[PDB]
């Protein structure tokens, strides 16, 4: 798929993603905080359509992500991210997508997620997260 | 003076400042790098005019600041930053302004300057720098 | 179990753990690097015996861990870390233990694991890792 790298910012305000209950995660876009002001990251879209949009609006800065979890698995002969769940200090968002395959989870004891990078073809191939104090 | 705080970024691409050889530093503005793309910082202007403009264009990312030095001292009754000098791994920019008073210098063995904050009235009252790996 | 927290250091030189092919991870001790000098961490021992010891000697500083993965599962009514695998930029060490239960994995694109904390009773109850540039 087409790789993307938003880079690192100072926080996260909103996450916009789409999924399909029969395949995997599709689109991914983030509204970051940049030194106190919102910064709209580029919209990284799937090569196809038919996904269900989801908007995760965080109550920045009192609310922040404490754990990210999901499932990766094979879809059409490709290994992709099939589901994502975002847990904050106030609420749990998700799971979004198909909770089938190999699970993964990243609990954060101290620190913050401040950026995302990855790749998207028909679906989100893989993703990584920038962490900072 | 009026305080300002640009915040933290990915690096520095250009610095635009103004000074008066017989008084002190006036205007201050920075074009930062924000994850590979230029980000024009707010122009922090002096309350008065009559300053000499200076443009410091760095060969980002191969060129970066290794040391910042200058002088502080009175201009009328106010203590301000009278002079500044920027030394990179390729050249030395400055000094700009009155090179007399109390010297200060910040050599960096490891790390980078990724942001500025301070205060400007008729002249640059004071300033601080954000540092990161 | 009995909690432990080694804290953060400069790097990792050697890992000494023990396991049992029918249960889970037992003892855990790390030899860290402290500013260029080996620093022997406290040996965190299981309350019981019968484990098979393993010594992972890294070619510090050229060799370092890039991914830690394993499985957590139930053993005698206790949720513990049943298996661990350490992948460096040179080799893969493990899996050690039983790869049954829920998998987890922490790949690192940029940065280093510089410390460990957790709890050990009969087996390794849980653990966390310190990360740094």
């Amino acid at each position: 798929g087409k790789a993307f790298d938003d880079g690192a910012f100072t926080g996260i305000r909103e996450i916009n993603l789409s999924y399909n209950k029969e395949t995997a995660i599709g689109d991914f876009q983030v509204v970051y905080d940049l030194n106190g002001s919102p910064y709209v990251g580029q919209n990284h879209k799937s090569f196809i359509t038919g996904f269900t949009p989801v908007k995760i609006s965080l109550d920045f800065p009192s609310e922040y992500i404490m754990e990210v979890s999901g499932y990766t698995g094979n879809v059409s002969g490709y290994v992709v991210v099939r589901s994502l769940t975002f847990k904050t200090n106030k609420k749990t968002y998700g799971p979004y997508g198909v909770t089938s395959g190999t699970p993964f989870n990243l609990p954060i004891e101290n620190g913050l997620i401040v950026g995302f990078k990855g790749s998207i073809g028909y679906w989100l191939d893989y993703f990584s997260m920038y962490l900072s104090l | 003076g009026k305080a300002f705080d640009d915040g933290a970024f990915t690096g520095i691409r250009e610095i635009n400042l103004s000074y008066n050889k017989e008084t002190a530093i006036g205007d201050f503005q920075v074009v930062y790098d924000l994850n590979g793309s230029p980000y024009v910082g707010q122009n922090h202007v002096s309350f008065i005019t009559g300053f000499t403009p200076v443009k410091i264009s760095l060969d980002f990312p191969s060129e970066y600041i290794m040391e910042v030095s200058g002088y502080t001292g009175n201009v009328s009754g106010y203590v301000v930053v009278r002079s500044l000098t920027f030394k990179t791994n390729k050249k030395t920019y400055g000094p700009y302004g009155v090179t007399s008073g109390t010297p200060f210098n910040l050599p960096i063995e490891n790390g980078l300057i990724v942001g500025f904050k301070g205060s400007i009235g008729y002249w640059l009252d004071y300033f601080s720098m954000y540092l990161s790996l | 179990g009995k909690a432990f927290d080694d804290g953060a250091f400069t790097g990792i030189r050697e890992i000494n753990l023990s396991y049992n092919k029918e249960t889970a991870i037992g003892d855990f001790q790390v030899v860290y690097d402290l500013n260029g000098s080996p620093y022997v961490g406290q040996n965190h021992v299981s309350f019981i015996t019968g484990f098979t010891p393993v010594k992972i000697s890294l070619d510090f500083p050229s060799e370092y861990i890039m991914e830690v993965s394993g499985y957590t599962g139930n053993v005698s009514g206790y949720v513990v870390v049943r298996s661990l695998t350490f992948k460096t930029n040179k080799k893969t060490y493990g899996p050690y233990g039983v790869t049954s239960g829920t998998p987890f994995n922490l790949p690192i694109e940029n940065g280093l694991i510089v410390g460990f904390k957790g709890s050990i009773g009969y087996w390794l109850d849980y653990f966390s890792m310190y990360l740094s540039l």
Binding site: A8, G70, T72, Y78, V79, V80, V81, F104, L106, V114, G115, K117, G118, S119, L124, D125, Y126, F127, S128, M129, Y130, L131, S132 | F9, T10, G11, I12, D33, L58, F60, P61, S62, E63, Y64, N110, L112, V114, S132, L133 | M66, N105, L106, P107, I108, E109, N110, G111, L131, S132, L133
Partner: peptide, 18 residues
């Protein structure tokens, strides 16, 4: 080094890259 700031990056999860 370079004039680009760096931060810890964990991942990726999904298709293998390394």
């Amino acid at each position: 080094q370079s004039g680009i700031s760096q931060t810890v990056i964990v991942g990726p999860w999904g298709a293998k890259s390394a």
